[PDB]
Design a protein around this ligand. Structure first.
Ligand SMILES: Cc1cc(C)c(Nc2ncnc(Nc3ccc(C#N)cc3)n2)c(C)c1
Lengths: 554, 428
């Protein structure tokens, strides 16, 4: 006899103020009962369960399911009422590793702790809470009462305790072997190293030897799985990784599902193949929320699926991370609020790729968007590699400086270099800081009646030029922009414009290069053609010069 | 005599479970730092590993204090603190030390030396749980819970307050002129003394606190890291709510007067009494923006009366220790940053300006974070409580970068101004 070490239990409790349930044991068939007894007899002879008495007033409905038309059955215990009353644990699976962050390995092995799982005991003071009953034949005897002595394979806290228990065991082995890497998921166990298959295979032996010191039976046999492994939707070679193949389906009447997430299929896979758009396919969920609907695929969402089946033609592999080489991210503008990026160490060997979609704002500009993409990419890169990549961006240095120095918000981009790949992100116009000498001064104004939705818009100038235009179906905000728009249309390449609209100023000060409102875009259109534009604000209803509220309230 | 065996009992409020806050990503270097630090904190019994039976989590990271190269450990206890019961005791925040803000100089001492040698309530330790994350989440995050009073916690200074008063007994009796304040891990010390004389009084209290902690036999050894050897210098003797000032010119263009009126109209929300009829009267008509308008005798007087009103400070402006302090910040360009601290709109308890060029100016965010620290520190000196900030920055940018420049053991609360202040140049 070679003595083994005990696996310390974990102090489990129920949610405060509550207690264990007493769910009805539903009637069974004689054969389902005869199956379970044989099953529950085996589990008891191994120590996975134990016989209890009437002192335990807790019950969980246990039943039987056939194992795909075979002679063997399957015991299922519905702990669904058990989980709603169990305390919360610290799950660590939240935020899975990303393959692009892993390093190359010469050898990678998968062990199996199928026996270690039931070698993991349960807190005894909690075992009472896990009780089930098999109805006897003909109900002419008291049903057998059982409790678990180990982590039940359907309980809420079974993964978290199995994981924690296993980690504490592996820790000294991983410590005295710094030249290997250990990882665990479900019933699996991954060991990688840069060892020759002789030294590597023998260390795998040592690990099974390590687990036998706690009484954990491990495979040893030539495992029925080899690289590449299929793990979390990934294909993991010890030197390469790529997703499990992405083939966009072929249908004529695309409904709600096969285009819109769901979870797949372009965003979960945009992490590796470059130049991918999804907005036109994403816009098919705007204002809709149907259970089933053959949604009209616009001719703007086909041109995206025409490139999607052009990029999905030639599959791309992802490389692993080399901590020595620099880390580099590159961004491109794709129009329509779309941005695409690749993170690589060596050119064209993308560790991973991605995309950023602009936020749901009313107005915006390219420079702001790029900034956001940079932060997202940055936060993502810290998650995966523990550092920020060096950036290459389609924006001139001089452009970046003009923007951040003159921008009311605080803003920042980490270390970066200009890459000359059109379209280049630019500033479309720049407002003067001082009134322009010699430029006509357009005092503008707009108003509308709340009831009739009727209003006016226009201007008067220092040269005598005047205009008022009447408007049907419009608002105060609408007439204030129209006023500025008119002054822009009718003025030379240089112009001073006085308004009282805090709203209009706040929009134009924001320096949008695009907008949801067409009236804002026409202004932007007008701004771009101008040499110098000075926009000045004055308070309303103070009889301030030029400002004639009288021409619009008529 | 000595009996530190007992642990000071602490609880939460009913309905409020402990802090369950996600750990945000860290960089390799800050992960290494926290590895070595927490390795020693566990080997000094300050913390100890925990199992999955502990679901609670409070974020953690690493900073570097001013003029130091030693990675320090900060715990963003902002969620635990607000969930932590209003510490009803002998100290809920000290009797208002208003003499502190009047002193010629004030030196800030990090008394994170610390709250160790004081255990924590066993049933409460679970609520101070944190994770040291790994890059790419390749290894399970190292979990811990505090066994003693942790830095950053609001209950920590309010528990040591019975202990801290006794440590400051030979002092405070020797120099009854000196005001001493304590907020979080910081001990503020102020005096009306000359700078040379003032700098000496601090070294005295420094060597004095090398007695009850840090050095010397035990007696009284123990306690957390002696990282107190630094001390910033503050001069609240040089401060105010800055006056609103109008231009003084010999010739005014229509633009000048258009701006003046804009500014006065704004100020009138703060100072009832402001008039603009006579200044606006010059404007009436559609003159060119650069045309010089000579001031009429009626307008000149109205400008003069306006200066008068503005010279005199605002009236009816009182602090209220129950309401929240709000700090606004505006970016003025060229490293200039204006700020206001208020509780009611247009009722400023304090305005100021910041312009320090150090690690700048090519990084707005580094400038902004330092500005936030400075404003928070001043706010600690005046009212003994940090304000809620309104940062002129997109949430995403700030959340990505602020921890790279932060050097304070405390952390204020903040929100994000997304609409540009029209009133930006008016506060310069
Ligand atoms: C599924 C899995 C497997 C392992 C061995 C790890 N741990 C780990 N840590 C550092 N670098 C690498 N690198 C690594 C490289 C190739 C393969 C394959 N096939 C697997 C891993 N892995 C991790 C984190 C996940």
């Amino acid at each position: 006899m070679v003595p083994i070490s005990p696996i310390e239990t974990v102090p489990v409790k129920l949610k405060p103020g509550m207690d264990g349930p007493k769910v009805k044991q539903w009637p069974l068939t004689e054969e389902k009962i005869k199956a379970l007894v044989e099953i529950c007899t085996e589990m008891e002879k191994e120590g996975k369960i134990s016989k209890i008495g009437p002192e335990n007033p807790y019950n969980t409905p246990v039943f039987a399911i056939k194992k795909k038309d075979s002679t063997k059955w399957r015991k299922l215990v519905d702990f669904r009422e058990l989980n709603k009353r169990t305390q919360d644990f610290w799950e660590v699976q939240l935020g899975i590793p990303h393959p692009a962050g892993l390093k190359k390995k010469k050898s990678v092995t998968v062990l199996d702790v199928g026996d270690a799982y039931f070698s993991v005991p349960l807190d005894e003071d909690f075992r009472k809470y896990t009780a089930f009953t098999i109805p006897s034949i003909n109900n002419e005897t008291p049903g057998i009462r059982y409790q678990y002595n180990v982590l039940p394979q359907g309980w809420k806290g079974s993964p978290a305790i199995f994981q924690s228990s296993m980690t504490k065991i592996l820790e000294p082995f991983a410590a005295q072997n710094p030249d290997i890497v250990i990882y665990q998921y479900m019933d699996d166990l991954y060991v990688g190293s840069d060892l020759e298959i002789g030294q590597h295979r023998t260390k795998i032996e040592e690990l099974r030897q390590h687990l036998l010191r706690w009484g954990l039976t491990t495979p040893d046999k030539k495992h029925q799985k080899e690289p590449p492994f299929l793990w979390m939707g990934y294909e993991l070679h010890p030197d390469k990784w790529t997703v499990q193949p992405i083939v966009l389906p072929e249908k004529d009447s695309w409904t709600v599902n096969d285009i819109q997430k769901l979870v797949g299929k372009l965003n979960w896979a945009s992490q590796i193949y470059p130049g991918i758009k999804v907005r036109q396919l994403s816009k098919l969920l705007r204002g809709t929320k149907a259970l089933t609907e053959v949604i009209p695929l616009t001719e703007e969402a086909e041109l995206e699926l025409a490139e999607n089946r052009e990029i999905l033609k030639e599959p791309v592999h992802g490389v692993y991370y080399d901590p020595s080489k620099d880390l580099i991210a590159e961004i491109q503008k794709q129009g329509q609020g779309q941005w695409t990026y690749q993170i690589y160490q060596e050119p064209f060997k993308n560790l991973k790729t991605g995309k950023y979609a602009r936020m749901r704002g009313a107005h915006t500009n390219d420079v702001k968007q790029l900034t956001e993409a940079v932060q997202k990419i940055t936060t993502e890169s810290i998650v995966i590699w523990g550092k920020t990549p060096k950036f290459k961006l389609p924006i001139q240095k001089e452009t970046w400086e003009t923007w951040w120095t003159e921008y009311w918000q605080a803003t920042w981009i980490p270390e970066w270099e200009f890459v000359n790949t059109p379209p280049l992100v630019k500033l479309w116009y720049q407002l003067e800081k001082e009134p322009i000498v010699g430029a006509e001064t357009f005092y503008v104004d707009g108003a509308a009646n709340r009831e009739t939705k009727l209003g006016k818009a226009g201007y008067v100038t220092n040269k005598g030029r005047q205009k008022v235009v009447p408007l049907t179906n419009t608002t105060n905000q609408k007439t204030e922009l129209q006023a500025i728009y008119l002054a822009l249309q009718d003025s030379g390449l240089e112009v001073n414009i006085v308004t009282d609209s805090q709203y209009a100023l706040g929009i134009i000060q924001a320096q949008p290069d695009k907008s949801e409102s067409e009236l804002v875009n026409q202004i932007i259109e007008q701004l771009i053609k101008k040499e110098k534009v000075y926009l000045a604000w004055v308070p309303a209803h103070k009889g301030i010069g030029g400002n004639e509220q009288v021409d619009k309230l008529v | 005599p000595i009996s530190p065996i007992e642990t000071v009992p602490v609880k939460l409020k009913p309905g409020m479970d402990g802090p369950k806050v996600k750990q945000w990503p860290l960089t390799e270097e800050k992960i290494k730092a926290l590895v070595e630090i927490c390795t020693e904190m566990e080997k000094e019994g300050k913390i100890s590993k925990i199992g999955p039976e502990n679901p609670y989590n409070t974020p953690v990271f690493a900073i570097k204090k001013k003029d130091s190269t030693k990675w320090r450990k900060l715990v963003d206890f902002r969620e635990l603190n607000k969930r932590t019961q209003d510490f009803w005791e002998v100290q809920l925040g000290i009797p208002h030390p208003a003499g502190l803000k009047k002193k010629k100089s004030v030196t800030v001492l990090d008394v994170g030396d610390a709250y160790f040698s004081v255990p924590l309530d066993e049933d409460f330790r679970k609520y101070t749980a944190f994770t040291i994350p790994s890059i790419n989440n390749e290894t399970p995050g190292i979990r811990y819970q505090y066994n003693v009073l942790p830095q950053g916690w609001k209950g920590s200074p309010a528990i040591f307050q019975s202990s801290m008063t006794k440590i400051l007994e030979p002092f405070k009796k020797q120099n009854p002129d000196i005001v001493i304040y304590q907020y979080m891990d910081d001990l503020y010390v102020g005096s009306d003394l000359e700078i040379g004389q003032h700098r000496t009084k601090i070294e005295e209290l420094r060597q004095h606190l090398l007695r009850w902690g840090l050095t010397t036999p035990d007696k009284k050894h123990q306690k957390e890291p002696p990282f107190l050897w630094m001390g910033y210098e503050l001069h609240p003797d040089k401060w105010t709510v800055q006056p609103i000032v109008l231009p003084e010119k010999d010739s005014w263009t229509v633009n000048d007067i258009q701006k003046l009126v804009g500014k006065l109209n704004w100020a009138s929300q703060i100072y009832p009494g402001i008039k603009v009829r006579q200044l606006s009267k010059l404007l009436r008509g559609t003159k060119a923006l650069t045309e010089v308008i000579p001031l009429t005798e009626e307008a000149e007087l109205e400008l003069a009366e306006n200066r008068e009103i503005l010279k005199e400070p605002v009236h009816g402006v009182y602090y209220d220790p129950s309401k929240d302090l709000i700090a606004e910040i505006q970016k003025q360009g060229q490293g200039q940053w204006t700020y206001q601290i208020y509780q009611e709109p247009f009722k400023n308890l304090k305005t100021g300006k910041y312009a320090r060029m150090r690690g700048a100016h090519t990084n707005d965010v580094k400038q902004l974070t330092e500005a936030v620290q400075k404003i928070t520190t001043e706010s600690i000196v005046i009212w003994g409580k940090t304000p809620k900030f309104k940062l002129p920055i997109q949430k995403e940018t700030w959340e990505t970068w602020w921890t790279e420049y932060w050097q304070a053991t405390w952390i204020p609360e903040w929100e994000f101004v997304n609409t540009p202040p029209l009133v930006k140049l008016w506060y310069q």
